[PDB]
Every structure is written in structure tokens, then in C-alpha cells.
Design a protein around this ligand. Structure first.
Ligand code: NAD
Ligand code: NAD
Ligand code: NAD
Ligand code: NAD
Ligand code: 1S5
Ligand code: 1S5
Ligand code: 1S5
Ligand code: 1S5
Lengths: 267, 265, 267, 267
């Protein structure tokens, strides 16, 4: 078992298509003991996580809620037992209001919406690290999910800006985490069909955005030297487990691309 | 005159050490006709801008104020005369509350503070472009100021995050600006002793020494050297982007840092 | 004139479509006094350079010829007069044997061929700097031509590797040039129709390489926020002139992109 | 056993301080069956490989020898048995003549020397993939060693240029390897005390260049959020093994940094 004996917190499960659900599944298959966190729809999330290979405690965490963050470490400790600490933390959380996405003009997104998106998608990586580092073991690993924002693209709009901010946040979280002997890294995944952008991807919220996204997906598989399957989150989940393991011990503040190699190819 | 006959808006002047003051000075020396914008202390800003080579109208602009942004294009047009449009726009605006800077712990900056910083330092680049693109001529140029955030570093903390956001915003503003025949670019400057240098050492008496060490280190790393007391090479670079001489460059970052970012030691 | 009173050496003219021909034309329009260097077909190059706005001396330079490089500074000095130095140098020189490009398999290019391409396309940037720095004025500028090699692509093959090497060479030339108060930079241009790859671009050396290149060009103009005209070298020439001027005085070891903004956009 | 049942070729062992020695040791600890290749000093190499946890066959391979490369796959097959194929290949091979490094001026390295260095350090990554891909299993992995050349630095000089070329070569090897269902990646390590470059360091002793090197090397530990120990190759060896495993299945054409996170930090 790649993660035998390791205690890992996984946030971000909302459906069985969630990248976090697959991370959790693979982690448990590899021997990890999990604590899960969920947002807003905890009754539904509980039914979904009951389908994981092993039973895991589910805790509520809205990353915009200061009370939730202040009590998190205490709640986790109660879940894993006094005297035990975490070895891993997975941040698989993102949101950008519709005004900041799709066919909505880039200039028309009010700052209040953009600010909410950046709070949830980027700042929360730092606040979860702040909350959880005091209960992590040395040798531990924090991993977040990125979508390569180094270039602009249609439809992704303000979420691209939030991911640029997240990459920067990760480099600073690494500085803090290193004081605890903990690594911090992002996995930059290729596009996966999940609930988050399903309405935009399907064309429901503007045919143009749907068409642009189809072009992006087709080009991604084309450019990836080993191809890319947008319906299979397993390669991404495996990569996250690699970073949670002891086998990338000198990598921190960094981004590991689980994208079929697409970002390394122009055409 | 590199910018002869060009009408250019320059934001960001607060003292005669401001990068924006030197941009304005060099632009005027090169024949540009300017409109200036200032934040908050407009009477004091007027006294500062009187030190420029030529007179220029000064307009109030708080980039967090939606009323200011909605009226800006109209106020500019009254300043430059009906029928006339801008050829250039300079965004030289930044702020991050002290909780997000210096020796204050990275984790202790509340989101309200970080969000204000991002609003002023990154989102406002898009806000300005939205307000002014409708009164810009084809061939025009929008330029903002950047400090290379590709790697983390001490003290710069959350402003680094805001600059990472700004670089992303710039790539999207370029998509919009291109529809108008306008380019959008950032100049990533080396460190300059402006009023804002005090923001990164907000420490004790060690501040002066730390700044002196920064200058020593940057000048060593830069293959052509670096003088933190001299904003002129940065100002010239901004003027190059405002000119007709980089006509195929957009969404991009020009480094005016003495070449330091290309060297490891 | 942007370059009034400046003495500038321009290498790399072979036809009137050469990027160097347009650099030369624009520089002369901006008041520069030129010295030109040409390779192999000097009688033909002389006829071509006679069509420039002003007369300029033409010197022979094969960058693989040690005797040519050893005598170059003295020949330039004779051309511009004793007591006078250069303010600028433009390297617009490239070559990669056909085995290293197009439909020819990447693995099948013999090292002898790849080595020749790297010699001419990358090492010679250092060779020319070595020869000419001793006769350059402080405030001077060396500029070479790059095609962004940060990602792999079809057909460009080993020339991509040579450009990666050239970018690295440029960073080291900057260190040396700095001692003389001279800047060194590359301009990464978008694709321009010139003699160099004309046979491959036309499909004459393999239809698939022609097809791949057409796709690359179509995509380039599409992504470029201000568009891209592959038949117009003028924007690239202007950019080189900007770097030769006094207006980018703090930029060195660097790469300026004159590509319509295409490299900043994914799609 | 991370590499249980995998058959892996490891090149580049010359001393028990070689990065390749540590890669081989860790791979064997994780259940891999190895074939080793050595250059020039085969009697010494055999004595050294006797220090590994398990016996592995040693084959001669000079990457500049076309006959060695032509016969390599047949020799490997005889070593692992007909019907069996490789799951992994490690390229841990590098060389740049002294003229191209250290206190020797950058401009004084003759191209003959630079070309040799680029042949061994960059082109041979493609040569080895060409020779071995036909006997690799799908799901397989090729890994090479890189030293981040994105910025210039004192002393490393023309080796930096060779590594820039290598990174470009890796992106093209990934295109070819993908046709076989094989991944290709580099690990960019922080500085390790392997005895490589001892002659370069020795020439720089007490000089400015020597001081520069010590400042540069020690810069990794300063900048690395988790620190960096130049005396310990194990974290690098582990990272290579992670890439050889099934746990980074969507990463190709890419660079993994095993440098303590130093490259993500400016100071
Ligand atoms: N799907 C892709 O193609 C892709 C590619 C690269 C990166 N990512 C990133 O991967 C992560 C997971 O995305 P996904 O595709 O699995 O979509 P998803 O919808 O299945 O998961 C996103 C999660 O964010 C959670 N969330 C939203 N607001 C929250 C809040 N205030 N507090 C706590 N949690 C909150 C949601 O409840 C949900 O569980 C995100 O960071 C996303 O940006 C997705
Ligand atoms: N000084 C450096 O070393 C350096 C290096 C690279 C980039 N920069 C950037 O250059 C730009 C100018 O900085 P500077 O060094 O000249 O400092 P400065 O203090 O002289 O200028 C900063 C400007 O931001 C303006 N500003 C703050 N809040 C505003 C608001 N709500 N609305 C409108 N304007 C507002 C200030 O009033 C001021 O005029 C900034 O973007 C800064 O981040 C500075
Ligand atoms: N055309 C494009 O799209 C494009 C895009 C980006 C960069 N570039 C680069 O721009 C430069 C000029 O290319 P071009 O497109 O004008 O093609 P070109 O054929 O018009 O010019 C290439 C020059 O290299 C010269 N050359 C070849 N071997 C030489 C040697 N041994 N010694 C001296 N000179 C030698 C040729 O004689 C010729 O004058 C090259 O470095 C090329 O790689 C071209
Ligand atoms: N030591 C470091 O700090 C460091 C850091 C990053 C990357 N690297 C890279 O790691 C790899 C291994 O280097 P090392 O430090 O273990 O030094 P090393 O001397 O122990 O290994 C280098 C290997 O290259 C082999 N080699 C040289 N010419 C050859 C040829 N013609 N044919 C076949 N093999 C040949 C040598 O025989 C030797 O075994 C190299 O690519 C090096 O550049 C080293
Ligand atoms: C134009 C880009 C197409 C590929 C996008 C890949 C991609 C990147 C994503 O970051 C993503 O996740 C979100 C996006 C938005 C919101 N509100 C919430 C989430 C969790 C989904 N997907 C699918
Ligand atoms: C570790 C070295 C960092 C050097 C930073 C250079 C630098 C970069 C800057 O972005 C900057 O400007 C500000 C920063 C903060 C605020 N509130 C307002 C401003 C205008 C000043 N300086 C001087
Ligand atoms: C697949 C990429 C297509 C666009 C390539 C752009 C481009 C890049 C080039 O480097 C180029 O110049 C050469 C290329 C090869 C040789 N032997 C000599 C030269 C001078 C021409 N072109 C046109
Ligand atoms: C000046 C940079 C200091 C840190 C360099 C790290 C480093 C990088 C290396 O690429 C390296 O390996 C060689 C270098 C040259 C040759 N001929 C052969 C080899 C195997 C050793 N080291 C130690």
C-alpha cells in the first residue's frame, strides 16, 4: 500500500464524479485512513461517501466560514483520536460565480463575484493550511488542484485569474509548511467532466462557450503525447496519491502536471 | 519625439518619486499630451504634478469607486476635447494592506485585507481598460506595472499573489483590447525607491540595511547593473510600449529589471 | 530617427523576404548607419542589398569559418572607420539540415547534422558576440532571432532544440556583454514566410509537414489578440529596432515576443 | 515494492557516489530487476555495482558509439531473456569538456568541445530512446537527469546550454515514446556531491569563480522551503523511482523538480 498507515484529510467531494471522490477512493485502496470534509449539502455528500471502499468520518467545512476554520483542527483531532496527527491534506475546492465564466463578458464581472471566487479557490488553500499545519506530522504533504492558467483562454475567464493566484499562494504556503517538515504542491490536471462546469460545457449557458470548450478538449487529447480521457479522473487521483506518499520527498512549492503531457506540446 | 501627438492617460502619481511621475515626465519630454489621475489627496497631487515639464489636467480616480469608473471616460473626453481619443493608458497603481506584507505572518492576513489589495492591484487593471477602451484609438497601448511574482520571496507576501493575478488579468485584457486594435502589456520593473518601498519593511531600524542589501544583490544579479534610485530606465520602457515600436507585442510582460530575472547569481 | 547616429551590423540577409532585410530597411529609415554581413552567395546578396534605402558595405561571414570570425572586427572597423565603434549587432542567422526537420523522423537525424544546425543557429550567437563586443560602445545592443521553443511541435523538430540552446546562450552572452555596458536579447517572432523553410511550408518535402504548418499558422493568427500576418515582417523589424534603440535600456538576457500576443493565449 | 516485477535499465554508474548508483540501489530495494550500462571504465564499474543490494548484468554503452547503440536492444534482450521487455529506462549521463565550464571564459570554449558535451548530455537522450523504445512495454517510463537551466549561473556555462537542449529533446522524445504507450520525463535535481565536476571546482579554488560556486550551491538550502542536503542523493533517487512507477501515469514531456523546492523561491 502506497499510503499505508497515513491519515489524510480530503475536501471537495460533492458528487461521485468529483476529482476528490477519486482521490479518496485511490487513497483508501492504497491503505490510507481518511477524514472527509464537505460543503453545504452534507446529507447528500454522506450518501455519496458511503460508496467509498472504506468508512470515513465526514466533517462540515465552508471555507468562507471563519467559525468552521477555527474549529476544524479540533474536529479532525476528535475524528482521528487524541495524540494522532494528519500526514496528508487534499484541497480539491473551487468556485467562480457564473458572471465570471462562460459567455459573460470578462469586463462585466463585478468585483464582489470575482472576490468570492478568489476567496474560495485561492485564499482558502492558505487558510486550510493555517488550520491544519499544527496537526500535521513532519514528512507530511498538502496537495491542491490547479488548471494551468499560464495562458488565457475562452470561457474560463476569471477562474483563470483565481488559479494564477492559487499558484502563487501555493509557493508561500510551502514556505510556512516547510517549518513543520511538510510539503505543499499543486497538481495541474487536464480537463475532467465534473459537476462544476457541466452546464457551461454542455452548451446550456451559451452555445459559444460550449463550442470553445469542445475545441479545447479535442485539442488537449490531440496534443497530449499519451492522449487524454476527459471522463477518467483516475490518472489525476494517482498523481495526487504520489504527492501524498513518501516518494516525492524533495518537491515543494511546485506544480506537477497530470495532463497527458499536453502543456508541453504546442500542436 | 517618440510619442509626438499621442494623448496618454497616466494614473498613479503620489510623489515625485512615483514610477508614474517619471513615466509622465519622460512621456512629456517625448511630446505626449497627458491627462493624469490621482487618488484621494488631489490637492497634494496637484502640487506634485506642477513639478512636471508641462501642465496637464488632473482627474480624480479611486479604482474602488464605481461612480469614478463610470464617469471616467466622460471626464477624460472633457479634458482632451470632444472628438479626441486616447492613444495610451498607464496603470501605475498598487496597494496591499500591511497585514499582507513584510514580517507580518502570511497566514494572519484576513481575507478582507487581501481582497482590498487584489481589487486595487489587479482587478482595477481590467476596470480601467473597461472604462477607457471605448475612448482609445486603434494602434493604442495599455501598460501596467508588475513585479515578477513567478517565485515566492520574503516580505512581498500577498502583494506577490496580487501581481500573479494581475499577470493573468493582463492576458485577458489583451483579448478585449485587441478588438479595438489596442495592445495590453505589463512592465516588470526591478525594485525602485518610491514611497512604496516602505511597504515591504513595515521590522525596525533594520529597514534601511535590508533595503541597502536588496540594492546590492539586485545590482550584482543584473548583467547591466541596477540603480534603485533611478526610475528613468523603467519610464523609458513604458514609453517604448506606448510608442509604435512594439506593435506585435500584447498580453505580455517586458522585464525592465537590469536582466536580473534571467540570472541565478 | 529612432536610431539616429547609431552604427549597426546586420547579418542574415539572403533574399528580400529575409527578416534581416526588413530589419535593415527599418533601421536605415530610422537613421542608422549599417554594415551588412552575408553568407555564401555574396554576388546575389549584393544585388539584393542595393535595394535598401541607403548604401551599406557588405562583408562576407560564414559563422562556421574561424578565419572569418577572427578577421571580422578588423574588417568592420575598416568599413566604419578607425576610432568608430558599433552601437548594435543583429544576429539573424539560422540553419538546420533537412534530416533534422519536416517529415523526417526525429530519431533519424544524425548527430553530425544536428551539430551543424546547433553550430550555426545557437553557438554562433556567442561567436559573433565574442568577435564584436571589443568594438562595441557602451549603451550598445545585440539582438538575435528566436522562435519560441518552450513546447514541442510537429516539423520544427531539431531546430526547436537549437532554439532552446540559443535562448540559453543569450543569457550567458548577456553576462559577458554587461561588462561592456552592452545588452543582449532575442526577439521571438511569429511565423513569417521566408526562403528558409519555404520548401517544407509549401508541402514539397512532405504533405503532412505542410499540413501541420498550415494548422500552426492558422492557429497563430486565431490566438493572437491583435492577429498575425505571416507575410509581413515589418512588426518584427520594428521590435528589433526598439531593442537596438535607447528605449529598452534595462532589458537584457531576455526574450521579447513579437508574435501578435499568440504565446500568451492557449486558444 | 514500488517497482515489483519491473525490468529497468540504468545507465550512468561510475562511482558509488553517482546519482545512478543511488537510483539503482533504491530501485532494487523496491523490487526492480535491473540491467546496468557503463562507459569506459568497465572494470571499476563492475567492482562498484558489486556494492548494490543485488547482482545485475552490466553492458557496455558509449553513447557516442553508433555500433554500441545499434546492438544495445539485442544485448539487453539477451540479458533479460527473449520475450521479456523493459518497463523503465534511466538516462543518468552527462559531460561537458573543461573548456566549457568553471573559470574558463564562456567565449573561449571551442565548438568541437561544446558539440561533444551536447552529444553526450542531450542528443544521447534521444539516441537511447531510439534504441530502447522497440523493447519497452506499454505503461513504461524513460527518465533523464536535468539541472534547471532556465536562468544563467556562474561556472555551469556551456553545460547549462546542453541542459536547455536536453529539456527540448525530452519534449520530442515524449512524442515518440507516446506511440509506444511510454512516458518520458526529466528530474531536475538540486546539487549533489557526486564527484562530477570535481576538476571544475578544483580549477576554481581560491578564485572568484570558486566563491561564486559555493554561494550558488549553498543557495539551494537557503531557498528550499524544506532545505537541501547536497550530501544525500536518496531524495533524488526516490523521485526517479516515482516516475518509473505506475503512480505518475499522466505526466510526460515534463520536468519534475527534486530540489527541495528551491526553484520556486527567489530568496
Ligand atoms: N474538472 C476539471 O477539469 C479540473 C481540472 C483542473 C483542476 N480542477 C480543480 O479541481 C478541484 C475540484 O473540482 P472538480 O472538477 O472535482 O469539481 P467538483 O464540483 O466535483 O468539486 C468542487 C468542490 O468545491 C467545493 N466548494 C465550493 N465552494 C466551497 C466552500 N465555500 N467551502 C468548501 N468547499 C467548497 C464544492 O462543494 C465541491 O465539492 C477544483 O479546485 C477545480 O478548480 C478541476
Ligand atoms: N517601487 C518598486 O520597486 C516597484 C517594482 C515593480 C512594480 N511596482 C508597481 O508600480 C506601481 C506604482 O508603484 P510605485 O512604486 O510608483 O509606488 P507609489 O506609492 O508612488 O504609487 C502607487 C500608486 O497607487 C495609487 N493607489 C493606491 N490605491 C488607489 C486607489 N484605490 N485608486 C487609485 N489609485 C490608487 C497610489 O495613490 C499611488 O499613486 C504599482 O503597481 C507597484 O506595485 C513598483
Ligand atoms: N521566418 C520565421 O518565421 C522565423 C520566426 C522566428 C525566428 N526566425 C529566425 O530568424 C532568423 C532569420 O531567418 P529568416 O526567416 O529571415 O530566413 P532566411 O533564410 O531569409 O535567413 C537565414 C540566414 O541564415 C544565414 N546563414 C545560414 N548559414 C550561415 C552561416 N554558416 N554563416 C552565416 N550565415 C548563415 C543564411 O544565409 C540566411 O541569410 C533565423 O535565426 C530564424 O531561425 C525565423
Ligand atoms: N551531481 C549534481 O549535482 C547533478 C544535479 C542535477 C543533474 N545532474 C545530472 O545527473 C546525471 C548524472 O551525473 P552525476 O552527478 O551522478 O555524475 P557521474 O559522473 O557519477 O555520472 C555521469 C555519467 O555519465 C557517464 N558518461 C560520460 N560520457 C559517456 C558516454 N560517452 N557514454 C555513456 N556514458 C557516459 C559517465 O561515465 C558517468 O557514469 C548527469 O546528466 C548530470 O548532469 C547532476
Ligand atoms: C475553457 C476551459 C475548459 C476546461 C476547464 C477545466 C476545469 C477547470 C476547473 O477549475 C474546474 O473546476 C471549477 C470551475 C468553475 C467553478 N465555478 C468551479 C469549479 C470546481 C472544472 N473544469 C472542467
Ligand atoms: C523581497 C524584495 C521585494 C521588493 C519589492 C519591490 C516593490 C514592488 C511593488 O509592487 C511595490 O509597490 C507597492 C507594494 C506594496 C504596496 N502596499 C503598494 C505598492 C505601490 C513596491 N516595491 C518596492
Ligand atoms: C512547425 C513550425 C512552423 C513555423 C516555423 C517558423 C520559422 C522558424 C524558423 O527558425 C525559421 O528559420 C529557419 C528554419 C529552418 C532552417 N533550416 C533555417 C531557418 C533560417 C523559419 N520559420 C518559418
Ligand atoms: C556551477 C553550478 C554548481 C552546481 C552544479 C550541479 C551539477 C550539475 C551537473 O549537471 C553535474 O554533472 C556533470 C557536470 C559536468 C560534467 N562534465 C559532467 C557531469 C556528470 C554535476 N553537478 C555537481
Amino acid at each position: 500500500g502506497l499510503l499505508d498507515g497515513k491519515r489524510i484529510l480530503v475536501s471537495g467531494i460533492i458528487t461521485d464524479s468529483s476529482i476528490a471522490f477519486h482521490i479518496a477512493r485511490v487513497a483508501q485502496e492504497q491503505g490510507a485512513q481518511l477524514v472527509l470534509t464537505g460543503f453545504d449539502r452534507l446529507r447528500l455528500i454522506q450518501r455519496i461517501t458511503d460508496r467509498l471502499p472504506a468508512k470515513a468520518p465526514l466533517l462540515e467545512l465552508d471555507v468562507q466560514n471563519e467559525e468552521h476554520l477555527a474549529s476544524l483542527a479540533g474536529r479532525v483531532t476528535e475524528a482521528i483520536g487524541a495524540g494522532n496527527k494528519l500526514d496528508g491534506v487534499v484541497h480539491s475546492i473551487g468556485f467562480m460565480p457564473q458572471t465570471g465564466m462562460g459567455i459573460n463578458p470578462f469586463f462585466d464581472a463585478p468585483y464582489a463575484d470575482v472576490s468570492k471566487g478568489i476567496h474560495i479557490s485561492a485564499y482558502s488553500y492558505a487558510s486550510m493550511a493555517k488550520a491544519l499545519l499544527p496537526i500535521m506530522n513532519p514528512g507530511g504533504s498538502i496537495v491542491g488542484m490547479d488548471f494551468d492558467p499560464s495562458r488565457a483562454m475562452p470561457a474560463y475567464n476569471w477562474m483563470t485569474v483565481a488559479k494564477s493566484a492559487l499558484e502563487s499562494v501555493n509557493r508561500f504556503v510551502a514556505r510556512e509548511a516547510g517549518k513543520y517538515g511538510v510539503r505543499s504542491n499543486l497538481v495541474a490536471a487536464g480537463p475532467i467532466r465534473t459537476l462544476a462546469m457541466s452546464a457551461i460545457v454542455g452548451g446550456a449557458l451559451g452555445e459559444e462557450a460550449g463550442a470553445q470548450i469542445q475545441l479545447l478538449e479535442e485539442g488537449w487529447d490531440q496534443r497530449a503525447p499519451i492522449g487524454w480521457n476527459m471522463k477518467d479522473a483516475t490518472p489525476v487521483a494517482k498523481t495526487v496519491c504520489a504527492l501524498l506518499s513518501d516518494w516525492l520527498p524533495a518537491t515543494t512549492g511546485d506544480i506537477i502536471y497530470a495532463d497527458g503531457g499536453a502543456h508541453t506540446q504546442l500542436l
